[PDB]
Design a protein around this ligand. Structure first.
Ligand code: M7G
Lengths: 180, 13
């Protein structure tokens, strides 16, 4: 018996392609719903850090396309956490794995229903790791998630994580930890 | 609702 996950998650992958547009690079790798199956994917895919520039992995509930326009996201936000370009080597893969284990293992308490997914952006300037939420206004639910994200990933108080919505002005973040 | 911690998940590897 494999151990059933509360729900079905989908791994997505996107490699940057200059000529082609965005949505067509968005490739659904597999859909799993047991711990054993998650590992089978994870053990055998390319480590996040190993990835080329402009590439992502998304892990989202099934039937949620990992984009803004999607209905599950249209009214949501995310918990952005930047990885320093130079301390990237020893942090990135921990942060991403620790998150995926946090989400599939349902660690955000009575708040799980608001988790949409998790994204890793491999980039030159900085690598990014975010947790997408369903509704960018439930600041209790968002704050609580962020506290847990900070715990799970052991992000210190000197590297602040921020929640922000999904122009006119530069839009400032809705929540920050530690606060200012 | 099914809850698995990181300790457990790693024993599944
Ligand atoms: C997550 N996302 C990214 N893009 C495209 O990806 C690019 C932005 O890239 P990014 O992956 O948000 O990070 P970057 O700002 O460091 O490049 C733009 O060209 C967008 O058109 C997106 N385009 C749409 N329509 N919807 C999305 O959810 C979406």
């Amino acid at each position: 018996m494999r151990h059933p996950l509360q729900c079905h998650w989908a791994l997505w992958y996107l490699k940057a392609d200059r000529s082609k547009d965005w949505e067509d690079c968005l490739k659904q790798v597999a859909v799993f719903d047991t711990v054993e199956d998650f590992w089978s994917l994870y053990n055998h895919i390319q480590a996040a850090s190993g990835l080329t520039w402009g590439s992502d992995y998304y892990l989202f509930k099934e039937g949620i396309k990992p984009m803004w326009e999607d209905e599950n996201n249209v009214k949501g936000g995310r918990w952005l956490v930047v990885v320093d370009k130079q301390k990237r080597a020893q942090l990135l893969d921990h942060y991403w794995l620790e998150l995926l284990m946090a989400i599939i293992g349902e660690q955000f308490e009575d708040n799980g229903e608001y988790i949409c997914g998790a994204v890793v952006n491999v980039r030159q300037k900085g690598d990014k790791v975010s947790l997408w939420t369903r509704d960018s206004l439930k600041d209790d639910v968002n704050l609580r998630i962020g506290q847990i994200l900070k715990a799970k990933l052991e992000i210190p108080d000197t590297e602040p994580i921020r929640y922000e919505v999904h122009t006119g002005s530069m839009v400032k973040p809705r929540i920050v930890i530690p606060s200012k | 609702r099914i809850i698995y911690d990181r300790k457990f998940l790693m024993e599944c590897r």
